[PDB]
Structure formats: structure tokens, C-alpha cells
Design an enzyme around this catalytic site. Structure first.
Site, PDB file in Angstrom:
ATOM      1  N   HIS A  12       1.609  -3.508   0.674  1.00 11.07           N
ATOM      2  CA  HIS A  12       0.345  -3.284   1.370  1.00 11.07           C
ATOM      3  C   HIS A  12       0.245  -3.886   2.788  1.00 11.07           C
ATOM      4  O   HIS A  12      -0.286  -4.990   2.966  1.00 11.07           O
ATOM      5  CB  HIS A  12      -0.759  -3.856   0.487  1.00 11.07           C
ATOM      6  CG  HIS A  12      -2.121  -3.287   0.736  1.00 11.07           C
ATOM      7  ND1 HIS A  12      -2.745  -2.455  -0.168  1.00 11.07           N
ATOM      8  CD2 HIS A  12      -3.027  -3.529   1.711  1.00 11.07           C
ATOM      9  CE1 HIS A  12      -3.978  -2.217   0.230  1.00 11.07           C
ATOM     10  NE2 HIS A  12      -4.179  -2.862   1.365  1.00 11.07           N
ATOM     11  N   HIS A  14      -0.263  -2.381   7.106  1.00 10.65           N
ATOM     12  CA  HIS A  14      -0.567  -1.248   7.980  1.00 10.65           C
ATOM     13  C   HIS A  14       0.188  -1.182   9.275  1.00 10.65           C
ATOM     14  O   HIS A  14       0.017  -2.058  10.106  1.00 10.65           O
ATOM     15  CB  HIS A  14      -2.050  -1.279   8.334  1.00 10.65           C
ATOM     16  CG  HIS A  14      -2.943  -0.809   7.233  1.00 10.65           C
ATOM     17  ND1 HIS A  14      -3.437   0.474   7.197  1.00 10.65           N
ATOM     18  CD2 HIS A  14      -3.404  -1.423   6.116  1.00 10.65           C
ATOM     19  CE1 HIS A  14      -4.162   0.638   6.105  1.00 10.65           C
ATOM     20  NE2 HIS A  14      -4.154  -0.497   5.426  1.00 10.65           N
ATOM     21  N   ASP A 292      -1.581  -6.996   4.977  1.00  8.98           N
ATOM     22  CA  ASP A 292      -2.568  -5.991   5.357  1.00  8.98           C
ATOM     23  C   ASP A 292      -2.542  -5.610   6.852  1.00  8.98           C
ATOM     24  O   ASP A 292      -2.040  -4.545   7.209  1.00  8.98           O
ATOM     25  CB  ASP A 292      -3.977  -6.438   4.912  1.00  8.98           C
ATOM     26  CG  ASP A 292      -4.897  -5.264   4.563  1.00  8.98           C
ATOM     27  OD1 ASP A 292      -4.456  -4.102   4.635  1.00  8.98           O
ATOM     28  OD2 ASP A 292      -6.073  -5.495   4.205  1.00  8.98           O
TER      29      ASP A 292
HETATM   30  O1  LIG Z   1      -3.922   2.754   8.270  1.00 10.64           O
HETATM   31  C1  LIG Z   1      -4.934   3.735   8.178  1.00 10.64           C
HETATM   32  C2  LIG Z   1      -6.330   3.133   8.368  1.00 10.64           C
HETATM   33  O2  LIG Z   1      -6.689   2.228   7.312  1.00 10.64           O
HETATM   34  C3  LIG Z   1      -7.615   1.260   7.849  1.00 10.64           C
HETATM   35  N1  LIG Z   1      -7.286  -0.046   7.252  1.00 10.64           N
HETATM   36  C4  LIG Z   1      -6.478  -0.981   7.794  1.00 10.64           C
HETATM   37  N2  LIG Z   1      -6.587  -2.132   7.169  1.00 10.64           N
HETATM   38  C5  LIG Z   1      -7.527  -1.936   6.168  1.00 10.64           C
HETATM   39  C6  LIG Z   1      -7.975  -0.660   6.193  1.00 10.64           C
HETATM   40  N3  LIG Z   1      -8.618   0.144   5.280  1.00 10.64           N
HETATM   41  C7  LIG Z   1      -9.395  -0.348   4.385  1.00 10.64           C
HETATM   42  N4  LIG Z   1      -9.428  -1.586   3.871  1.00 10.64           N
HETATM   43  C8  LIG Z   1      -9.103  -2.863   4.514  1.00 10.64           C
HETATM   44  C9  LIG Z   1      -7.710  -2.933   5.101  1.00 10.64           C
HETATM   45  O3  LIG Z   1      -6.632  -2.826   3.912  1.00 10.64           O
HETATM   46  C10 LIG Z   1      -7.489   1.323   9.390  1.00 10.64           C
HETATM   47  C11 LIG Z   1      -6.406   2.335   9.655  1.00 10.64           C
HETATM   48  O4  LIG Z   1      -6.786   3.185  10.743  1.00 10.64           O
HETATM   49 ZN   LIG Z   2      -5.029  -2.000   3.646  1.00 10.49          ZN
END
Ligand SMILES: OC[C@H]1O[C@@H](n2cnc3c2N=CNC[C@H]3O)C[C@@H]1O
Ligand SMILES: [Zn+2]
Length: 349
Positions: A12, A14, A292
Site C-alpha cells: 500500500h 502511492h 501510503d
Molecule cells: O493514487 C490515486 C489517488 O488515491 C488518493 N490517495 C492517496 N493516498 C490516499 C488516497 N486515497 C484514499 N485514502 C487515503 C490514502 O491511502 C490520491 C490519488 O490521486
Molecule cells: Zn492509499
């Protein structure tokens, strides 16, 4: 001295939330697009969070820099290659990076993201750019890297299209489909577009992961589980508020993608209360420690581990077990998954 200086597995994290401040700066200048700060340090401070906010609050941070990355082929690939490098240095031997392909595109996307001016970068194109970068990162640094395509809670029309991308690039980096975004949107988990996408993933063997219980009630975790058919659950701290659901998911070996620091900064976790992951630990639940959005959270993987070590009481033993569990619950094919477990077991002696 890091908390656990041994191989790790991260599921998990991003891509768009793990870009280097230096690289954001580079493109802002090169493209003549604006940024909320002019130096890397000042940029770090404004894109990063020091204190708990909210899920919507945290989501506003992407507006700061995405405009500069989205639409540029060289940028999309570059952040992919640099991502791997960043992880290798963290001791991560295997990672799964998530990102919304539509949010980095500038053509063939109905609601044009970030007020972008029409270009030629298709959502599909961003998937191919990311694949190249991650694959060059693997060869270059020696760690296995896979991707996950994110459905956005507020845009279910993009969902069936995400499903196709996962199909097209199956195991050619893309290992699963996710549902990210603003969980506060009442009933977003159940929008037909999202539903249809996951139902189709089940029919086509595409792996599923869903954010739920981060900020929403355990009822949202139940939607993810019963309707969406998730194999894993991103966050899931609130599941424990519904004992029956919790123990059911516990007895089903449900994997929880836990992000300790993240949960603090977004408000997902009330610091006045013992973190869900402590219960997870004590119950021998199947979970993982993830970062995250290291960019927005101004963190590394050691941030979560230390946190769980100093507070919460995690031992080296629990870290090994927790990582072996992430390996088993990864979205890798059996052969590759064995190779991973061999690596962990070899290097854990
Ligand atoms: O990567 C795709 C999208 O998800 C969002 N995203 C990024 N971090 C989080 C997000 N979504 C929801 N929960 C909290 C955290 O885990 C932003 C990004 O544009
Ligand atoms: Zn996330």
C-alpha cells in the site's frame, strides 16, 4: 538506527503520492507551470503535513503538484523509475505501487484532470509509461516491483476502463485493481460503475483491493467484502467496531494494508485511543505496515516501523511475521511468490 533493518514488503503505497520534491520542482520550472513554493525545502513543507487533518484535507495536497507531472511522458516515467530507487534504499525487496492512470492523463479523459490543456497522453499511455519506469527500476536496483490501478470513488465512469487496463497489462506490472479517494462520499463504494468493475474482476481473475474502514464505518468494509469482493482491505481500522465482521474477516485470513503514520495524519486514527494495529498484532491478524504517501507525509518506511516499535510494542519477530504475511497475501503468481518467501526466509536467518 532503523527499527527493522531487514527485507520488507510493501503493498500500500502511492506513486503520485511518492514523488521527490526535487522532481516536482524540476517539471514546474521546465513546463512553466506553477507550484506553491520555489525551493525543494519550501516545497516539502507546503506539500507535507505536520498535523492530523482529514481525508478530504489530505486529498487537497495533490492539487499542488499533480498539474506539473500529469501530461508529461518524461515525468510519468521518471517518477516510476525513481520510486523503485527510493524503495530499494528502504530495504523493500517487493512492492506494489498504486496510482490512478486517469489522473496523470491529458487526453481521452472526460473530466479533464487539473484543468489540463488537451494533449496526447492517454490513460492507457500512462500505464505503459509507468510499466517502463518500474521495470527499468527493477533491473537497475534489484527489487521486484508491481503496479495496481486505482478506481476513484468520485468517478465511477473511469472504473470499467481501469478494469480493461488491468486486463491488458495483467502481470505485465499490473497485479490488481483498487478503489481510492474520498471515503466520506456516502455510498460511493456501491456506484454501479465501481460495482460492475469489481464483479468483472472476479469473473476475469483480476485481483482486487479496496480502501475501507480508513475513515468510514465497518459497514463500508462490509460493502467492500460482500459486494466488491476484496481480497485485501486498505486501512480497515474501523472494522473492529463491528466485532462480528472483524472476527469473521479474522477467521477468513483477511489481509489488512495498515499505514500507521498515515492513519494519524488523516485523522483515520484517534491518537487518544490505542491503534487498531495493536489489536491486529495481538490477534495474530494477517496485516502489513505501509507508508501510503511518503511525499505528503514527509516519511520513509522506517517512520511506520519506529512508530509501531516505540509506541505499540512491535518486536523484530512481529516484523518478520508481518512481512512474510504480506508476501503470502501479495498479488503475485505462485511461482514468483515462492521466490519471494525464499528471499525473506534466507535473509531473515
Ligand atoms: O493514487 C490515486 C489517488 O488515491 C488518493 N490517495 C492517496 N493516498 C490516499 C488516497 N486515497 C484514499 N485514502 C487515503 C490514502 O491511502 C490520491 C490519488 O490521486
Ligand atoms: Zn492509499
Amino acid at each position: 538506527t532503523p527499527a527493522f533493518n531487514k527485507p520488507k514488503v510493501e503493498l500500500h503505497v502511492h506513486l503520485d503520492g511518492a514523488i521527490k520534491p526535487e522532481t516536482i520542482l524540476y517539471f514546474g520550472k521546465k513546463r512553466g507551470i506553477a507550484l506553491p513554493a520555489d525551493t525543494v525545502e519550501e516545497l516539502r513543507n507546503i506539500i507535507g503535513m505536520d498535523k492530523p487533518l482529514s481525508l478530504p484535507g489530505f486529498l487537497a495536497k495533490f492539487d499542488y503538484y499533480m498539474p506539473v507531472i500529469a501530461g508529461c511522458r518524461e515525468a510519468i516515467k521518471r517518477i516510476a523509475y525513481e520510486f523503485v530507487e527510493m524503495k530499494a534504499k528502504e530495504g523493500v525487496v517487493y512492492v506494489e505501487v498504486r496510482y490512478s492512470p486517469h489522473l496523470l492523463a491529458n487526453s481521452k479523459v472526460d473530466p479533464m484532470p487539473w484543468n489540463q490543456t488537451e494533449g496526447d497522453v492517454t490513460p492507457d499511455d500512462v500505464v505503459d509509461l509507468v510499466n517502463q519506469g518500474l521495470q527499468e527500476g527493477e533491473q537497475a536496483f534489484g527489487i521486484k516491483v508491481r503496479s495496481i490501478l486505482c478506481c476513484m470513488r468520485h468517478q465511477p465512469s473511469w472504473s470499467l476502463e481501469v478494469l480493461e487496463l488491468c486486463k491488458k497489462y495483467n502481470q505485465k506490472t499490473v497485479v490488481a485493481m483498487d478503489l481510492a479517494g474520498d471515503e466520506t462520499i456516502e455510498g460511493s463504494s456501491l456506484f454501479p460503475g465501481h460495482v460492475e468493475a469489481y464483479e468483472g474482476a472476479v469473473k476475469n481473475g483480476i485481483h482486487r483491493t479496496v480502501h475501507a474502514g480508513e475513515v468510514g464505518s465497518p459497514e463500508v468494509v462490509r460493502e467492500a467484502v460482500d459486494i466488491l469482493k476484496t481480497e485485501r482491505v486498505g486501512h480497515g481500522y474501523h472494522t473492529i467496531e463491528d466485532e462480528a465482521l472483524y472476527n469473521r474477516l479474522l477467521k477468513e485470513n483477511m489481509h489488512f494494508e495498515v499505514c500507521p503514520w498515515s492513519s494519524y495524519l488523516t485523522g483515520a486514527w484517534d491518537p487518544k485511543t490505542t491503534h487498531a494495529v495493536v489489536r491486529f498484532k495481538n490477534d495474530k491478524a494477517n496485516y502489513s505496515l505501509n507508508t501510503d504517501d511518503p511525499l505528503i507525509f514527509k516519511s520513509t518506511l522506517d517512520t511506520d516501523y519506529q512508530m509501531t516499535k516505540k509506541d505499540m510494542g512491535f518486536t523484530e519477530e512481529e516484523f518478520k511475521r508481518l512481512n512474510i504475511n504480506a508476501a503470502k497475501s501479495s498479488f503475485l503468481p505462485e511461482e514468483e511468490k515462492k521466490e519471494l518467501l525464499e528471499r525473506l526466509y534466507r535473509e531473515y536467518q
